[PDB]
Amino acid sequence: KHNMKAFLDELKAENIKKFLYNFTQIPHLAGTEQNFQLAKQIQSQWKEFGLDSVELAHYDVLLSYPNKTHPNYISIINEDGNEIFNTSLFEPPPPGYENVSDIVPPFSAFSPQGMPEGDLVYVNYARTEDFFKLERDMKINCSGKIVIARYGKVFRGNKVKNAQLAGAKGVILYSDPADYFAPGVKSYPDGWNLPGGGVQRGNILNLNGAGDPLTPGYPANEYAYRRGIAEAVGLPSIPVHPIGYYDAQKLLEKMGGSAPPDSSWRGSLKVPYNVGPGFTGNFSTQKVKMHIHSTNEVTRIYNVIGTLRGAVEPDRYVILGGHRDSWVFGGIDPQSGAAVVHEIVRSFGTLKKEGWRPRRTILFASWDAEEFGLLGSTEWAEENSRLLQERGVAYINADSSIEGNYTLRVDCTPLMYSLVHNLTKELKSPDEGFEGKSLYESWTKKSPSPEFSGMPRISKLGSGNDFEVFFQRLGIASGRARYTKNKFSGYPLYHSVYETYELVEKFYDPMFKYHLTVAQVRGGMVFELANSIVLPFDCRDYAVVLRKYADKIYSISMKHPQEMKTYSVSFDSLFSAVKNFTEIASKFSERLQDFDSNPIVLRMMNDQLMFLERAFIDPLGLPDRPFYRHVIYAPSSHNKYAGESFPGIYDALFDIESKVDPSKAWGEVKRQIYVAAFTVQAAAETLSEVA
Amino acid sequence: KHNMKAFLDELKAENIKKFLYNFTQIPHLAGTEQNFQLAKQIQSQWKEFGLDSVELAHYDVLLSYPNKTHPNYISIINEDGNEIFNTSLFEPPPPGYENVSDIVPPFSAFSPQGMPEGDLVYVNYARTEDFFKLERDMKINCSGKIVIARYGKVFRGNKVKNAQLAGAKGVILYSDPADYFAPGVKSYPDGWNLPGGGVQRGNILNLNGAGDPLTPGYPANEYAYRRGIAEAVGLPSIPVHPIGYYDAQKLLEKMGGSAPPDSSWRGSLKVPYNVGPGFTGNFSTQKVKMHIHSTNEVTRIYNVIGTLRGAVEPDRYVILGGHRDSWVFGGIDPQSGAAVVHEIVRSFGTLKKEGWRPRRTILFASWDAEEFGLLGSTEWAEENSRLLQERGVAYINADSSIEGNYTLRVDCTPLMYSLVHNLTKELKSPDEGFEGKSLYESWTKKSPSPEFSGMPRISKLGSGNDFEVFFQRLGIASGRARYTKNKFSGYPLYHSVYETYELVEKFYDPMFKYHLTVAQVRGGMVFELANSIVLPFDCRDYAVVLRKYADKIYSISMKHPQEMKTYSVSFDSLFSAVKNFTEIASKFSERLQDFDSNPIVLRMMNDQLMFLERAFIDPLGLPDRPFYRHVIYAPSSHNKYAGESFPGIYDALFDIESKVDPSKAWGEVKRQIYVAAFTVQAAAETLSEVA
C-alpha cells in the first residue's frame, strides 16, 4: 500500500548521514560559487529522485562580506595611538580543515564601515530591559560610547538596534562561556563546547520582514528598481563586530566605572563585569578602536524549487522548505535540516516512481541567503504571493534538525496542534529509556505543557527563520520541529567554523536516530497535509489559545487600573469576539464531522480551513511594520526570535507609564483592542455557514 | 424551463414604474428616519419576494447636515458691512411638493464652518489645467481669495482640493446653463432642464477610497475606535457652497481684473466671465462673504443585504448592489436604479418559489450613505473583506438606470466585455427605429468603439459610485450599465429637488422601456455570472487592453526623449510582461475550451478566472492612496469619476517637467514601471498550469 507508513518506512538514518557528509565538506556561503554548485547538485538529484519539475529561482539581493585584503579587527589603543592588543583575524580552523579555502572570517553581516575609537560600556545582553537598567536606574549614558554586549537571550539585530538608539557609536558582540560553555563538557574538537577562539557569525539587520533591503514588497528580479543604500531597509548605522571569549576577556578585564548592578549581569569570565564607562585607574587613557571594512554588494542567490504535482487538488500547495546557505560548513545549521529534506524528497519520489501521487501538490524548497535575512524565501514569496495566498495550505520549515539530543521542540500555529499530537503518538521515541514508547510519550514527559496535564509544550512562531514570510506576511499555516537540548541563545558552536560533520557524527547523533525522528515528524506532517481528504487543522485549538492570549493581554493592561478607568479602556469587545469565535468554531467542527460524498462541500470546507489562518492577516500591517500583517502573532519587537501574541496591543501597552502624553498612548491601546476584536470576529465569520 | 429567458421574461416595465413611484414620494436622505423606514420596507419586501435571508447591516459614520436654524448663504457686502445681495435659502419646490417637509436645502456636504469674506476669482471648472492656466500663464494668485467655479467635467471634490491647494479661502460652486441647460428644452416642470433657482447638492470629500472618514480600514461598528476630526480622512479645510445660475449671475456680473483667456472659459450667462480678482471700478470695495454653519455628526446608516443561496457553489458570491439614500426625492438618482434592483429580486424570487436556485450565491444590496462618500458599501466591504476577497466572483452596480434616453452606457472590467457583447446581442433594442433589432446593434450604431469596427464603446471604471471598494480596493471583477444621453457633468437636474418621479415619467421614460432594458442587462449579467458552469470571463480581453494601455503610457513618456535617455527609462519590462500575459492567456483559453466531466479542474479553472482580477491588486496600494490597490486602474487623481490606466506610472509622469529634482522624479517613473511589469507578469502566472 501507499500510505503514510510506506512513506515513513522508506526514510533511512544512513541516507541522512550520507547526505549530511556530502553537504558539509566545503563552505556554502550565500552568493559564492560553491553554494551555486550545491544548488545545481540538489536540482539534479531532486530530478533523479522523481520530482515533476525542479527549477532554480534566482534573485540579485544585497549581501555583505569582509574585505579579503583589509581585515576587520578591534584594538585597545594607548594615548600615543599604539595598538597594544588586537583581536583575532580568524578562528583557528578545526583538525583536518586547516587547509580549507574560503572560510569567511567572523564578521557581523551588514555592518557599515568605520574606525570608531572610544570608551567601553558593558550592557549585559543589550536587551531593552538592560538599557532601561543602565539609563534609568544606574544613570549611565551610552551616547558616544562603544558598547560591549554578550550574545544570548535575544536576536543579535535587536541588540544592535537597542545600542544604536542608546547613542552607541559601535557594538562589540562576544560569546560568554556562561551562555556558550556547558559545565563538564570539553571544547571542540574533543566535545561540543565553544573554544575561546570560537566566534558566532550572523547578520545584524532589522528588516521586520522586508526581505532584500533594496526591494521591499517586490522580487529582486532582473528589472527591479532598487532603493539607494541610504533608503535601504534595516541596515545598522554603527559598526559591529563579534569576538570570542579569549578576546573578550582582554577587553573586559580593565573595565572600571560602576560595578554590575546584580549577579544576572555577571558571566563566567574572570573579570568584574564592571559596566564602565571606560577602564580603571592606570588604563583610563587607553581606548577601544574598531576597524570595520566590510562591504555590501548586490549578489545573485539561487533557490531550488521542486514540484510533486497533486493527483486531485494540484492547485493546493503544501510546502516543505529550508535553507542551504551556511556561514561556514553548516554541520548543524542548515545541513542537518537540508539532509533531512533530501531524504524526504527521496522517499516521496520512491512512492511516485511506483505510481502514487499525493492528493495535493507538494513544493520542496532549498532556500538561499537565509543567513543574510531570510532573503531567498522572502524574495520567492514576494514573486509568488498571489499563488501562495490563494493556494497555500501549509508551510513546514526545515532548518537544523538537531540542536541537542534531549527531546522534540515544536513551534506552530494552533491549527496544527492536533496533527502534531496525533502524528507523534504514532512515531517511535528514539530516546534512551523510552524504547517501545511513542515519541508523544517521551516528548510530553520531557517537555510538559505549562497548561495541560499529559500534553507537550508547543511554542508560538516568531521569526528568525524562513517560515516568517509565509506565516507573518501571507497568513499561511506554518510549523517547525527539531530535536533540542534541556532557548534563544543557540547551542555552543552556533555559526562558528567548528560546526562540522564531525561535531554531529561524534557528539550529537552518532546513529542519526534523532535526524530520522525529525524526518518522520516533518515528513509525516507534510504527508498528512498533502494527502488527508479533510485538511488536518482543528479550528477549536485556535479558540482555546485566543482566550489564553486575551486573558494575558488584559492582565498586562490591568497593571494600570487608574488609566483604564480614566480613558475607559475596555477589553469587552475582544472577549466577545473570542467567545463568538469559540461558538462558531464548535459549530463548524460539528458540520465538518457531519457534512455529506459531496466534494464541493468538502472543498468548500477545506477552503474554510485553508483561509482561516489567512483571515488573521490585516492588509494594513502592524504599526510601522507593514510586512508583519498577522494580528494574533508577530515577532517580538524586542527579540525577533520570540513570538508575541496580540502584538499590536502588546506594543501599545509596553512601557506605557513612560509615555509623555497618556491620553494619546491609551487611545492607541484602545485602537489596537478594536483592531484585534474586529479581526478575531472577522476570522470567526469565515467559519460560519457561507450563505 | 428555468433559464435566463424565463428570468428575463418575468421582468416587467409596469412593476419598475410602480416601485419608482413608491420610492420617490418623500425624501430619503442618509441618516434620516424616512431612509431607515424605506430600508425596513425593502427588507420586508425582499423577504416576501423569496430571498433566503435579508438583514440590515448598520454602521455609525460621519455625515454632514446644514443647521436648520442657522442657514447657509452667500452675500455681496459693501464697505459698510451691509449685505446687499443674498443667495437663496432653498430651491423653489416643484408643483405639488411645496408642502413636503424635510427637503434638505442645497449645501456642500462636509464643508467646514466659516464666514470668509474676500475678492472673487473665477476658475472655470477648477480643473488641474484651469489652475495651471491661472497661475502659470495668467500669473493670477488665488491665495486668500474666494474662488467661484462652475460644476461639470470633473468630480466636485477634485475642484475643492485644487482650490484649497491654490490657497483659496472658500469655494462657490454653481451650475452654468452652458453645462446644465440643453438648447431648445424647457426648464422643470415643463421640461428636463435646470431652472435658474435649481442647485446641485453633493459631497466634497477626497476620501481616495477610505469610506467613513473616522474609521479607515475597519468597519464603523459599535466598538469602533474613531479618529478625532482633526485626523479624519478627506475633509476640506475651506468652506464650500453651491448655488444656481440666477444667483451666480449676480456674483459674476461685477467681476473685473483679467478677461477670460479664451472661449473655453466662457459659459452661457450674460456676463464677461472675467477672471478677477475682485469686481470692476465702482464695485471694487465690495466683497463676497460666505456663511456656512453646517455640522458633521456621527449618524447611523443601514444597508439591506439579501441572500439567495447557491445550489452548487454557495461559497461563491455574485453581488448586485446599488444605493437607496438620496439628496431629496431621488427620482433618477438612485431610485431609478433601486426600482430596477427591486424588480430583479422579484424575478429571481419567482424562479426560486418554483424550485430553482442559481448555481452560485447571489447577494443583493441596498446601500446607504452613497451620497456622503460611498460610506455604506465601503463599511460593509471593510467588515466582510475576507469573505469577499476569497469568495467574490463579481459586483454589478445599480445606481440610476437612466440619465438619458439615447443609448446604453457600459463601464466594466475587460473580463466582462465578452459577456456584455453576447448578452446585448440577445436583448431587444428599445430604441425608436431599431424595432426588431438587437440592443447590441443599436448600441454599437450609436456609441461606436473608437478602436474596432462593428463593436460598441465600453469605458473603464474609476470611482464615484459603490463599485469602488469592490473593484479598486478588493480586486473583484465589476461592471455597470445604464441608459445615457448623446459625460462627467451629470444631466441637468442632477442632485436637485426637481429630480422627481414626474421628471422620469413625463420626460425620460414614459413607457419604462429603457428601465426595462437596463433591468435585462443588469439582471442578465447577474444571471450569467451566477449560473454559467464556467465563469463568463475572457482573460484574452484583458491582454488586448493591457497592450493598448502600455502603448498609451509609453507614448506619454516619449514626450520626454532626452530624460528617457539620461535616466535610462525603459518600458521593455512592461511590454515583455504584456506579451507574456497574452501568450499565457491564449494557452489558458485553449485549456478552458479543452479541459475534461471533472469538477475540480472546472473549479480549479473557475478559481483561476475569479482570482485573475484579484491578481492586479498590490497590497501596498498606490502612492499615498493605500485604498486604491488595483495596479491597472485607479480613479484619476484629477477627477474621481474617470478611470486612469497604469495610474502609478501616469501620476509619476504627470507634469514631470515641472519637478525640481528630475533624477528623483524619473527614478519614481522607473519604480512604477517595475511595479506594473511585475504585477502584469504575476497576474499572467496565475493563469499558468498550477503544477
Ligand SMILES: *[C@@H]1O[C@H](CO)[C@@H](O[C@@H]2O[C@H](CO)[C@@H](O[C@@H]3O[C@H](CO)[C@@H](O)[C@H](O[C@H]4O[C@H](CO)[C@@H](O)[C@H](O)[C@@H]4O)[C@@H]3O)[C@H](O)[C@H]2NC(C)=O)[C@H](O)[C@H]1NC(C)=O
Ligand atoms: C458576537 O456575536 C454577537 C451575535 O450573537 C454580536 O452581537 C451583536 O452585538 C451588537 C453590538 O452590541 C448588537 O448591536 C446592536 O444592534 C441593535 C440592532 O439590532 C442596535 O439597536 C443597537 O444599538 C443601540 O444600542 C447601543 C448600545 O447601547 C447604542 O450604542 C446605540 O446607539 C443604539 O441605541 C446595537 O447596535 C447586535 O444587534 C448584535 N447582533 C446580534 C445579536 O445578532 C457581537 O457583536 C459579536 N461580537 C463582536 C466583537 O463582533
Ligand SMILES: *[C@@H]1O[C@H](CO)[C@@H](O[C@@H]2O[C@H](CO)[C@@H](O[C@@H]3O[C@H](CO)[C@@H](O)[C@H](O[C@H]4O[C@H](CO)[C@@H](O)[C@H](O)[C@@H]4O)[C@@H]3O)[C@H](O)[C@H]2NC(C)=O)[C@H](O)[C@H]1NC(C)=O
Ligand atoms: C516573460 O517570460 C519570459 C519567459 O519566456 C521571461 O524570460 C526570462 O527572462 C529573464 C530576464 O531576462 C531571464 O533571466 C536570465 O536568466 C539566466 C538564467 O536562466 C541568467 O543567467 C541571466 O542573467 C545574466 O544576464 C543578464 C542580462 O544581461 C545579466 O544582468 C546577469 O548579470 C547575467 O549575466 C538572466 O537573469 C530568464 O532566464 C528568462 N526565463 C525563461 C526564458 O524561462 C521574462 O522575464 C518574462 N517577462 C517578465 C517581465 O517577467
Ligand SMILES: *[C@@H]1O[C@H](CO)[C@@H](O[C@@H]2O[C@H](CO)[C@@H](O[C@@H]3O[C@H](CO)[C@@H](O)[C@H](O)[C@@H]3O)[C@H](O)[C@H]2NC(C)=O)[C@H](O)[C@H]1NC(C)=O
Ligand atoms: C486526531 O485524532 C483524533 C482521535 O482519533 C481525531 O478525533 C477523532 O476524529 C474522528 C473523525 O472525525 C471522530 O469520529 C467521529 O465521531 C462522530 C461522533 O461520534 C461521528 O458523527 C463521525 O461520523 C466520526 O466517526 C472522533 O470523534 C474524534 N475523536 C475525538 C476525541 O475528537 C482527530 O480528528 C485527529 N486530528 C486531526 C486529524 O487533525
Ligand SMILES: *[C@@H]1O[C@H](CO)[C@@H](O[C@@H]2O[C@H](CO)[C@@H](O[C@@H]3O[C@H](CO)[C@@H](O)[C@H](O)[C@@H]3O)[C@H](O)[C@H]2NC(C)=O)[C@H](O)[C@H]1NC(C)=O
Ligand atoms: C460569447 O459567445 C461566443 C460565441 O458563441 C462564445 O465563443 C464560443 O464559445 C464556444 C464554447 O467555448 C466555442 O466552442 C468551442 O469550439 C472549440 C473549437 O472549435 C471546441 O474545441 C470546443 O469543444 C467548443 O465547441 C466557440 O469556438 C466560441 N466562438 C468564438 C468565436 O470564440 C463565447 O465564449 C461567449 N463569451 C462568454 C460566454 O463569456
Ligand SMILES: *[C@@H]1O[C@H](CO)[C@@H](O[C@@H]2O[C@H](CO)[C@@H](O)[C@H](O)[C@H]2NC(C)=O)[C@H](O)[C@H]1NC(C)=O
Ligand atoms: C556529493 O554527492 C554528489 C552526488 O553524488 C557528488 O556529485 C557527483 O560527483 C560525481 C563524481 O565527481 C560526478 O560524476 C557527478 O556528475 C556528480 N553528480 C552531481 C549530481 O553533481 C559530489 O561529488 C559529492 N560531494 C562530495 C563533497 O562528496
Ligand SMILES: *[C@@H]1O[C@H](CO)[C@@H](O[C@@H]2O[C@H](CO)[C@@H](O)[C@H](O)[C@H]2NC(C)=O)[C@H](O)[C@H]1NC(C)=O
Ligand atoms: C595590531 O595591529 C596593528 C595593525 O597591523 C599593528 O600596528 C601596525 O604595526 C606596523 C609594524 O610595527 C606599523 O608599521 C603600522 O603602522 C601599524 N599600524 C597601525 C594602524 O598602527 C600593531 O602592532 C598590532 N598590535 C599588536 C599588539 O600586535
Ligand SMILES: *[C@@H]1O[C@H](CO)[C@@H](O[C@@H]2O[C@H](CO)[C@@H](O)[C@H](O)[C@H]2NC(C)=O)[C@H](O)[C@H]1NC(C)=O
Ligand atoms: C410603498 O409600498 C409599500 C409596500 O406596499 C407600502 O407599505 C405598506 O403600506 C400598507 C398600508 O399603509 C401597510 O399595511 C403595509 O404594512 C406596508 N408594507 C410594508 C412592507 O412596509 C407603502 O405604503 C408604499 N409607500 C408609498 C409612499 O406609497
Ligand SMILES: *[C@@H]1O[C@H](CO)[C@@H](O[C@@H]2O[C@H](CO)[C@@H](O)[C@H](O)[C@H]2NC(C)=O)[C@H](O)[C@H]1NC(C)=O
Ligand atoms: C441678507 O441677509 C442678511 C441676514 O439676514 C440681512 O441682514 C440683516 O438684516 C436685519 C434687518 O434689517 C438686521 O437687523 C441684521 O443685523 C442683518 N444681519 C446681518 C448679518 O447683516 C440683509 O438685509 C439681507 N440683504 C438683502 C439684500 O436682502
Ligand SMILES: *[C@@H]1O[C@H](CO)[C@@H](O)[C@H](O)[C@H]1NC(C)=O
Ligand atoms: C578592500 O581593501 C583593499 C586593500 O586595502 C582596497 O584596495 C579595496 O578598495 C577594498 N575592496 C572593496 C571591495 O572595498
Ligand SMILES: *[C@@H]1O[C@H](CO)[C@@H](O)[C@H](O)[C@H]1NC(C)=O
Ligand atoms: C548623553 O550624552 C550626550 C552627549 O554629550 C548628550 O547629548 C545626551 O543628552 C546625554 N543623555 C542623557 C540622558 O544624559
Ligand SMILES: *[C@@H]1O[C@H](CO)[C@@H](O)[C@H](O)[C@H]1NC(C)=O
Ligand atoms: C547527548 O545526550 C547525552 C545524555 O543525556 C549527553 O550526556 C550528551 O552531552 C548529549 N549530547 C549533546 C550534544 O547534547
Ligand SMILES: *[C@@H]1O[C@H](CO)[C@@H](O)[C@H](O)[C@H]1NC(C)=O
Ligand atoms: C445651529 O444653530 C442654532 C441657532 O443659531 C444654534 O443654537 C445651535 O448651536 C446650532 N446647532 C448645531 C447642531 O450646531
Ligand SMILES: *[C@@H]1O[C@H](CO)[C@@H](O)[C@H](O)[C@H]1NC(C)=O
Ligand atoms: C500668492 O499670495 C500669497 C499671499 O500674499 C503669497 O504668500 C504667495 O507667495 C503668493 N504666491 C505666488 C506664486 O505669488
Ligand SMILES: *[C@@H]1O[C@H](CO)[C@@H](O)[C@H](O)[C@H]1NC(C)=O
Ligand atoms: C428622449 O428622446 C427624444 C428623441 O431623441 C428627445 O427629443 C428627448 O429630449 C429625450 N428625453 C431626454 C430626457 O433626454
Ligand SMILES: O=C(O)CC[C@H](CP(=O)(O)O)C(=O)O
Ligand atoms: O535574519 C534572520 O531573521 C535570521 C537569520 C538566521 C537564522 P539561523 O541562524 O540559520 O538559525 C539568524 O538567526 O542569524
Ligand SMILES: O=C(O)CC[C@H](CP(=O)(O)O)C(=O)O
Ligand atoms: O462620493 C463619491 O465618490 C460619490 C458620491 C456621489 C455618486 P452619485 O451622485 O449618486 O452619482 C456623487 O458623485 O456625488
